[PDB]
């Protein structure tokens, strides 16, 4: 990187949400339920077998 | 990278959502349910067998 | 990269959503259900067997 300016490296911007989600009922046993706004702003992830920004994520392997 | 400016490297911008999702009922046992806004802003991911930005993700291998 | 400016490297922009999805009922056991807005902004992914931006993703191999 050098004199170059206005670097807009990963940005989550201008997220607006309006929700009238009335009368909800979430039920499970061993599962994953994700609701609502979610944002990540990673820039560099390294490593073999590395998991980044996992939502609604399930692992049951050996 | 050099003098070149206005670099717009990965950006999630202008996400607007309006939801009137009334009378919901989510049910499971070992599954994954994802609802709502989700955004990621990764730039560099390295590594063999690396998982990035996984939603509604299921693994049951050996 | 050099003096060249206004680099618009991967951007998710201007995402608008209006939803009146009333009277919903999601049910499963080991499956994946994804609902709602989802956006990713990766730029570089490297690695053999690497999974990027997986939604509604299922793995049951050996």
From Swiss-Prot, chains A, B, C:
Sequence repeats: 5-19, 20-30
Gene assigned in the entry: SNCA
Domain of life, source organism: Eukaryota
Descriptive protein name: Alpha-synuclein
Disease named in the record: Genetic alterations of SNCA resulting in aberrant polymerization into fibrils, are associated with several neurodegenerative diseases (synucleinopathies). SNCA fibrillar aggregates represent the major non A-beta component of Alzheimer disease amyloid plaque, and a major component of Lewy body inclusions. They are also found within Lewy body (LB)-like intraneuronal inclusions, glial inclusions and axonal spheroids in neurodegeneration with brain iron accumulation type 1.
Free-text note regarding domains: The 'non A-beta component of Alzheimer disease amyloid plaque' domain (NAC domain) is involved in fibrils formation. The middle hydrophobic region forms the core of the filaments. The C-terminus may regulate aggregation and determine the diameter of the filaments.
Binding site for Cu cation: 13
PTM sites of type Phosphoserine: 50
Residue span relative to the full protein: 38 to 99 of 140
Quaternary structure and partners: Soluble monomer. Homotetramer. A dynamic intracellular population of tetramers and monomers coexists normally and the tetramer plays an essential role in maintaining homeostasis. Interacts with UCHL1. Interacts with phospholipase D and histones. Interacts (via N-terminus) with synphilin-1/SNCAIP; this interaction promotes formation of SNCA inclusions in the cytoplasm. Interacts with CALM1. Interacts with STXBP1; this interaction controls SNCA self-replicating aggregation. Interacts with SNARE components VAMP2 and SNAP25; these interactions allows SNARE complex assembly and integrity.
Family from the record: Belongs to the synuclein family.
Region described as 4 X 11 AA tandem repeats of [EGS]-K-T-K-[EQ]-[GQ]-V-X(4): 1-30
Upper lineage: Eukaryota, Metazoa, Chordata, Craniata, Vertebrata
Subcellular location: Cytoplasm; Membrane; Nucleus; Synapse
PTM notes: Phosphorylated, predominantly on serine residues. Phosphorylation by CK1 appears to occur on residues distinct from the residue phosphorylated by other kinases.
Expression by tissue: Highly expressed in presynaptic terminals in the central nervous system. Expressed principally in brain.
Known function: Neuronal protein that plays several roles in synaptic activity such as regulation of synaptic vesicle trafficking and subsequent neurotransmitter release. Participates as a monomer in synaptic vesicle exocytosis by enhancing vesicle priming, fusion and dilation of exocytotic fusion pores. Mechanistically, acts by increasing local Ca(2+) release from microdomains which is essential for the enhancement of ATP-induced exocytosis.
Source organism: Homo sapiens (Human)
Effect caused by changing residue 2 to F: No effect on osmotic stress-induced phosphorylation
């Amino acid at each position: 990187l050098y004199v170059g300016s206005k670097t807009k490296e990963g940005v989550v911007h201008g997220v607006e949400t309006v929700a009238e989600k009335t009368k909800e009922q979430v039920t499970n046993v061993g599962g994953a339920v994700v609701t609502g706004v979610t944002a990540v702003a990673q820039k560099t992830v390294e490593g073999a077998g590395s998991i980044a920004a996992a939502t609604g994520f399930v692992k049951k392997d050996q």
